[PDB]
Amino acid sequence: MTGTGLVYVDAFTRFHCLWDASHPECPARVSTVMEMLETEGLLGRCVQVEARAVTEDELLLVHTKEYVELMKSTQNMTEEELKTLAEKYDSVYLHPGFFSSACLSVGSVLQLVDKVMTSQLRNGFSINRPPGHHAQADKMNGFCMFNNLAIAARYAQKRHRVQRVLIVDWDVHHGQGIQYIFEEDPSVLYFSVHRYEDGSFWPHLKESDSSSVGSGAGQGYNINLPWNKVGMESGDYITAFQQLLLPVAYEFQPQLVLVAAGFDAVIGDPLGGMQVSPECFSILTHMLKGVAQGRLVLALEGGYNLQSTAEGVCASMRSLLGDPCPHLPSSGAPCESALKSISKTISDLYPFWKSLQT
Numbered sequence: 001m002t003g004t005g006l007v008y009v010d011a012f013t014r015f016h017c018l019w020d021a022s023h024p025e026c027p028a029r030v031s032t033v034m035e036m037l038e039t040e041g042l043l044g045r046c047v048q049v050e051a052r053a054v055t056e057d058e059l060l061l062v063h064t065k066e067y068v069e070l071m072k073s074t075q076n077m078t079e080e081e082l083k084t085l086a087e088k089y090d091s092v093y094l095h096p097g098f099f100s101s102a103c104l105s106v107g108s109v110l111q112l113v114d115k116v117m118t119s120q121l122r123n124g125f126s127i128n129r130p131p132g133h134h135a136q137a138d139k140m141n142g143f144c145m146f147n148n149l150a151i152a153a154r155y156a157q158k159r160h161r162v163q164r165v166l167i168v169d170w171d172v173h174h175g176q177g178i179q180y181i182f183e184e185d186p187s188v189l190y191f192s193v194h195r196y197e198d199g200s201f202w203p204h205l206k207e208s209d210s211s212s213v214g215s216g217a218g219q220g221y222n223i224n225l226p227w228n229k230v231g232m233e234s235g236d237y238i239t240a241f242q243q244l245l246l247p248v249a250y251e252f253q254p255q256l257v258l259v260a261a262g263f264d265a266v267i268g269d270p271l272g273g274m275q276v277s278p279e280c281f282s283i284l285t286h287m288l289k290g291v292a293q294g295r296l297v298l299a300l301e302g303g304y305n306l307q308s309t310a311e312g313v314c315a316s317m318r319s320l321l322g323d324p325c326p327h328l329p330s331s332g333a334p335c336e337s338a339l340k341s342i343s344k345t346i347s348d349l350y351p352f353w354k355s356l357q358t
């Protein structure tokens with residue numbers, strides 16, 4: 001059970017925003033990542049895995065046949081028809097090749113799920129766009145068309161008999177799509193740390209607060225860690241993982257870990273406003289390898305500084321390949337605002353996880 005998978009196809013670069021040449025979700029995001037992985041010698045050390053289109057059967061695991069057909073109906077629309085449909089969604093652009101690339105974006109994750117759950121690879125990383133963690137059952141959202149990881153979690157449960165999936169969302173934006181799809185599901189534990197600022201940061205939702213601990217059977221299986229001050233650094237995330245996610249992770253005992261690996265919380269991102277060094281994601285990735293026998297699959301979400309995102313992917317890739325953890329320039333001590341958000345989240349999840357009762 002050795003090797004690290006890497007999935008990248010040029011179709012990820014064959015769709016862009018037609019009415020805005022400076023849109024941050026651009027093909028240069030994934031192309032700059034591949035360049036740095038090659039120049040740093042990391043790309044050659046990975047087992048290249050080919051992608052595949054997601055079937056209508058797999059897409060229907062979280063979406064509706066109506067919405068899937070409308071998204072399929074977008075490849076034959078004109079630009080005026082793409083723009084009038086996109087305007088019906090929140091923060092979304094469309095393109096005749098968008099739907100095609102989105103299908104390869106979803107299947108790229110499932111390809112790694114196959115190889116990892118069959119012990120052919122130890123872990124994997126898909127360098128894919130469009131992102132996915134905002135896509136919902138019958139609508140696009142936040143540059144996403146289809147929910148890559150939410151599909152992959154249900155796919156692994158059905159195709160590979162997995163009972164417990166852990167989804168770690170370290171993107172700077174709350175993945176409200178994944179939270180909605182699994183709001184009552186106790187078999188898919190969704191953790192999200194994100195910028196919130198009491199709701200003044202997009203998507204400006206109260207459901208992104210720590211008090212949305214899931215409902216019904218999934219009561220306690222949705223953990224939101226909302227930041228409320230910008231400038232969070234590596235010590236805030238390390239403390240967050242060590243005192244909140246990892247204790248709940250070992251108690252949950254998942255058989256597969258899927259990471260919404262966005263990098264808009266890295267230094268210099270135009271949107272995240274956070275101060276996390278890229279080397280920190282070598283530490284966060286390393287922590288996640290002690291869970292689920294290291295069955296770890298990462299998929300690109302956000303990250304819009306071309307240099308910051310590529311550095312984050314590279315730092316994550318070094319941990320996947322087993323390279324030594326890096327020296328972190330930032331202080332391992334968290335800030336007071338982070339401890340307040342960590343404390344409040346521990347309180348909202350205290351009655352559901354014995355590892356937090358302290």
Ligand SMILES: C#CCCCC(=O)Nc1ccc(C(=O)c2ccc(NC(=O)CCCCCCC(=O)NO)cc2)cc1
Pocket residue numbers: 022023024091131134142143171172173202262264270271301302303
């Ligand atoms: C050196 C030096 C200077 C560098 C400074 C710089 O260039 N700043 C800068 C700022 C803005 C832009 C945008 O064009 C732009 C437009 C619209 C939006 N929409 C939204 O925010 C609301 C919803 C967003 C979905 C997020 C998806 C996601 O990530 N899910 O994980 C965002 C950005 C480009 C550059």
Ligand SMILES: [K+]
Pocket residue numbers: 169170171172173174175192193194
């Ligand atoms: K997040």
Ligand SMILES: [K+]
Pocket residue numbers: 182183184185186187188189190214218221222
């Ligand atoms: K859940």
Ligand SMILES: [Zn+2]
Pocket residue numbers: 171172173262264301302303
């Ligand atoms: Zn994001």
